[PDB]
């Protein structure tokens, strides 16, 4: 079983900020990390697949990078709708573990 | 010529060393009976498109075919079967009271790139050498046939272009001219290949003249004097203004055609005469689109 | 439009048998994996399994194999998450998803509404 | 016959059977063009030719 | 017997071990102008050894977002070596070319370059975007010289013609998994037996990535594309003072 | 005064009439023709040259029109997945409009003969995979799975030192000629479908891209012919040339 972890467990920022979260895998999934966005009381929404490919209908401010064991999701300019929980899962093996989750909240 | 390098020299070898030969193909290629192939080493199906050549695979080597005697003719895909069709190349308007040609005379620079169909047909090739058949159909804007006498004059480059309906050039002592009536059938003449070069080139990657090429004289880029065959002047034959507004449509039918250097066909809307300009903010895909690559 | 519609809010008791359905519309059915995701109240997403309906092929998570059965009726285009004996630890939101059309390695690209299962006495 | 040979296709490897009523050869009918094709000029312009059964890159 | 090749001309040699073949444009080898086709009566000069040799042009960098580039011939060599000097000193020029595009990568890189030769490659302007102003390209864009010019709209080849049909002309593909070089031998194409090397460009060499470059992090991120070319059967006539344009 | 009787069709101007017209320049001789490379005698010569077939005609915006010239192939689940699909009608609106054969067919009403589509794999050298390219003759709907597509004509393609394969679409027609198919009654002239499925998988080792692209190049065989020339409708002009 591949164990996925995310860092930081939760970060805070304001509109226009540059958010960045990291996902670490126990094993060496090549580039099969998927980033999902889930808002409270809503279903998960695929943002990034293949660790870099932007899903259709996603704003360009989302960027995926990394491979092997280290991956990163970056929001160039954080927006009000970008304050949600971001999960990383590995699709390389079965089971396809989900990340613990990283929550982004408005800072004050 | 004593040194050995001169004796065994290939300098001056003017013969064209061509690796191909044209063969008669009056009909489509026949099909041969082919059975299963269960072997190793030879793979007709597999190609290498990196070489830059088309696939030489055939039906016989990919499926089990039957003997088909193909008598379908290839005669309709020749250049004359494709270009010996008159098409609208020009339109000239002599209105009674307007601004385009209000003095009963008009000069039209001979250029067959003013209309999409004929232009896109001809520009399939880079070089073309042909004779032409020009037909002139004159009538009123509504299409009525009226009793009017018109003079068509061909003014090669360097001849005095008429500046008025009663200028001296209309004496046509040496310029070929046609006097026609609107009630007569449409005029029709045949023109030879009159370029100083061996063929008309619809594309000229260069500048006609030497010197500095600054921003002002950029419109001369692509201008080939070898294609500037002159002017076509049309007037109403008379000292007084004509009674009717007129329109003369010029249709060109190429014949004895030869073409060189086929090139990709235009997929963007033409914008200007004798110019490959295109709308940069309206670039469209060559064909239609679809939502997905797995649904049709 | 490609969409997945689930059964709906479900309330049961600890020891009955439940079978949560999810129907996919707007696309084929025997061409894409579906799979199920569990989210315990206040927790994150947990992958349960994947089902390929055409020639039903099921991959299970080790932590869920033996507790649930993922199946798929291709005739009606509906996946199922049958339970044999509900436990008190089955209260959660269950999402039926659909993996990326371009490749099953590209995650779950379509998501259903979600079914809230609540088992208590 | 006895007329100017000043057509655009004179001096070429093509056959023409045209009709003319004037002394200028370019005023003649288009006629028929010999059905000779050279696909390999554009389709297989390789210096070293390969056969169908032969893998092109050996 | 087909992937290894050695192109030797003048005092220059190119050895390639991942070649595909030699494409002879339109199945016609370059030749000298014949006496019947000759127009000018003065005796042309044939400096062949000093001009018929491989000159290496600039080096472009293939990226993952590269659109493509085009060069104009003989505009690239008008300022290079004895060939350039002869072109500037003479009014009439004639020659074919052997063009060799080089692009080597590892066996883990992937991508496809289309290398084509389009005769009379006239560059079209965007006509002010909306297609209302009869703008014309500047002199640098129509004759970019040895440095070349980068395509703005490779789909229409900056001329309104589809890239998809550019294989109608003599061409090859540099597919990184198959070959790392492409060789096209193009004859002298023109409606005139001779022409000026400073005003008219016989053709344009287009290098366009059809399949985008792609590799993995850690692999060499620099993938150069080099353009070498050899004039062949070069002839010059009309000798006077040297003129650059 | 030789008696004559002019018949109907007198004075009519027929644009496709091969006749004798009055020359304007007597005793004129054209500039002699020098040898120019690349002479074209028949249009079919250009039909046998392979031009890029835009199977991936999903994108429309001008920023990503180059992505239309190749379609992706990635690692799958080994379930005989469908890579791509298109129609085999060369004179019909779709992927074929981008080909030289497709544009030349727009100028002719009827066509006959076999087609060829060469697929070139532009992935890495270390990537392996097998595809199944299937031509389904007319009448058969779009195959729902690889097992159904295997019933029509097909070729199994293995990536290797030869980066390209050729699917020859044979001339399987009830009529000696086919008009250009389109939605409606003329779908009777449909040629069939072409479907690309995964045969085994797209495999690749560590350190190479997980995705590659396939480029399609369509052409016509030597039995191909066209008939009944006409005016094309692929492109129509607006804002008349200025
Ligand atoms: C009594 C009137 C006779 C009219 C004579 C017209 C002369 C016809 C000469 C051939 C025309 C060649 C077609 C023109 C070429 C192109 O449009 C441009 N000049 C080059 O792009």
Residue numbers in the entry:
A (entry chain L): 1 to 108
B (entry chain A): 2 to 297
C (entry chain H): 1 to 121
D (entry chain D): 12 to 69
E (entry chain B): 10 to 254
F (entry chain C): 1 to 242
Question: What does the report in the manuscript say about this coordinate set?
Answer:
EV71 is a picornavirus and its capsid contains 60 copies of each of four proteins VP1–VP4, arranged with pseudo T = 3 symmetry. In contrast to the canyon and fivefold vertex epitopes, the margin of the pentamer is not within or adjacent to known receptor binding sites, but we have shown that natural infection can induce neutralizing antibody responses to this part of the viral capsid (notably the so-called the plateau epitope, located close to the icosahedral threefold axes). The cryo-electron microscopy (cryo-EM) structures of the EV71 virion in complex with two representative plateau-binding neutralizing antibodies reveal that their binding footprints are conserved in the great majority of circulating EV71 strains and these antibodies are therapeutic for lethal challenge in a murine infection. In summary we have shown that humans naturally infected with EV71 make an antibody response that includes rare neutralizing and highly protective antibodies that bind close to the threefold axes of the virus capsid, and larger numbers of non-neutralizing antibodies, many of which do not bind the viral capsid.
